[PDB]
């Protein structure tokens, strides 16, 4: 039996970020089922940072995370965590009222947000079909996230604070014993006053092992693919491109193009694979909107974006389950919110007020709590 102050289940971006901030204050042990910590959703994202995306709570967590991403502590990483990647949201269906509403709502959080006419949008991504473009919003502050550097920065930070990150340690049994949580894996047993459930799409399965009422988390499949651009086209500086109704997105990635139908098909928690129909739909939508020809993609994959009913993230203690803390419902936003979520969850776990910079972004304990979910 190994004792810790905080026992975290899951070493994806959620468990890693929470563990990183916790590790300055006590012994953190993170238990990860897979042989590597980023095998599931944290290794499958589009790795983008967009403030004007998700619910108001999501947008506040994303905005509050920028300070850490742009100014991490010395030794956290060797190169910047963010690289510039503006986001351009294009109206392909002639809906100026919706385009206006998205512009006005986005500019309220991003003062530099711009409204583009169709000619400006086509100047920025010249493969757009001009006759299908009716305008666009443009966020000059968008960024791509170096998810490997960020994730490993969190994980290394735990280990440098005498914490442990244990892979090939699937939590198989969970029990409340003598005022602490005990977790049995095949390879060992672990004990801590606080159990941090950061198991991604599996968070409700973990609650199942513990006898704790679940949140109603719904994993949703999103597929993506990479394909070659035409040889005479330099797309490496293009913004992230999204349609106004999030029917698809397209962005440069490693000399290639990354496309997606931006789907959200409800599924059970599992090692999710792309569906041929997902890929064909993404290819059709991109070819409908642009002059690009997509041969069979060179690489396809899918990951899980997991939501509770209201679309907001969850960080708080369970009702009537002492020491059981949820870090869940990261949705499509777990990377870009990870710094605020990790710092906020660590404060809440320790029963401390949220730091001032987080409260200045409108964050509070109430908007993160799982107990807000009414059945
Ligand atoms: C699929 C997908 C997701 C995107 C995408 N885009 C973005 C994006 O642009 N920006 C962003 O912030 N998030 C984006 N997301 C979302 C981001 O991927 C998720 O929000 C984020 O990765 C969720 O992080 P979590 O830590 O909550 O989930 P993980 O699956 O990474 O980690 C959970 C861990 O728990 C572990 N676990 C489960 N059961 C366990 C057990 N019994 N014992 C031990 N470990 C367990 C799992 O093995 C796993 O490693 C995207 O284009 C796609 C296609």
Curated annotation (Swiss-Prot):
Pfam families cross-referenced by the UniProt entry: DAO (PF01266)
Top-level taxonomic group: Bacteria
Reported pH dependence: Optimum pH is 8.7.
Signal peptide segment: none
Required co-factors: FAD
GO biological process: arginine catabolic process; arginine metabolic process
Induction, per UniProt: Induced by growth on D-arginine, D-lysine and 2-ketoarginine (2-KA), but not on L-arginine. Repressed by DauR. ArgR could be a transcriptional activator of the dauBAR operon in response to the presence of L-Arg.
Site (Important for specificity toward positively charged substrates): 87
Other noteworthy facts: In vitro, it is essential to include phenazine methosulfate (PMS) or iodonitrotetrazolium chloride (INT) as the artificial electron acceptor in the reaction to ensure DauA remains active with FAD.
Name recorded for this polypeptide: FAD-dependent catabolic D-arginine dehydrogenase DauA
Organism expressing this protein natively: Pseudomonas aeruginosa (strain ATCC 15692 / DSM 22644 / CIP 104116 / JCM 14847 / LMG 12228 / 1C / PRS 101 / PAO1)
Gene this chain is encoded by: dauA
């Amino acid at each position: 039996m190994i004792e810790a102050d905080y026992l975290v289940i899951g070493a994806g971006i959620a468990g890693a970020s929470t563990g990183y901030w916790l590790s300055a204050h006590g012994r953190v042990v993170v238990l990860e089922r897979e042989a590597q910590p980023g095998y599931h959703s944290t290794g499958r994202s589009a790795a983008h940072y967009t403030v004007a995306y998700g619910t108001p709570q999501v947008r506040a967590l994303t905005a509050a995370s920028r300070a850490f991403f742009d100014n991490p502590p010395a030794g956290f990483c060797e190169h910047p965590l963010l690289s510039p990647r503006p986001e351009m949201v294009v109206d392909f269906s002639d809906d100026p009222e919706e385009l206006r509403r998205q512009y006005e709502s986005g500019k309220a959080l991003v003062p530099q947000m711009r409204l583009l006419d169709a000619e400006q949008a086509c100047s920025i991504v010249p493969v757009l079909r001009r006759d299908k473009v009716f305008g666009a919003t443009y966020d000059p502050t968008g960024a791509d996230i170096d998810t490997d550097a960020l994730h490993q920065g969190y994980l290394r930070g735990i280990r440098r604070n005498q914490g442990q990150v244990l892979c090939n340690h699937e939590a198989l049994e969970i029990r409340r014993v003598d005022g602490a949580w005990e977790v049995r894996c095949d390879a060992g047993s672990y004990r801590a006053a606080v159990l941090v459930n950061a198991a991604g799409a599996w968070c409700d399965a973990i609650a199942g092992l513990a006898g704790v009422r679940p949140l109603g988390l719904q994993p949703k499949r999103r597929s993506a693919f990479i394909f070659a651009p035409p040889p005479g086209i330099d797309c490496h500086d293009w913004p992230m491109l999204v349609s106004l109704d999030e029917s698809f997105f397209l962005k440069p990635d490693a000399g290639m193009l990354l496309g997606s139908p931006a789907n959200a098909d409800p599924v059970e928690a599992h090692d999710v694979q792309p569906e041929q129909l997902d890929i064909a739909t993404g290819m059709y939508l991109i070819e409908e909107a642009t002059t690009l020809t997509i041969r069979r993609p060179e690489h396809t994959w899918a990951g899980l974006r997991s939501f509770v009913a209201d679309g907001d993230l969850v960080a708080g203690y369970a009702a009537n389950a002492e020491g059981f803390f949820w870090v869940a419902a990261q949705g499509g936003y777990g990377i870009q919110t990870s710094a605020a979520m990790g710092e906020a969850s660590a404060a809440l776990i320790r029963h401390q007020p949220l730091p001032a910079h987080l409260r200045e972004h409108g964050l509070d304990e109430a908007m993160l709590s799982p107990r807000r979910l009414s059945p």
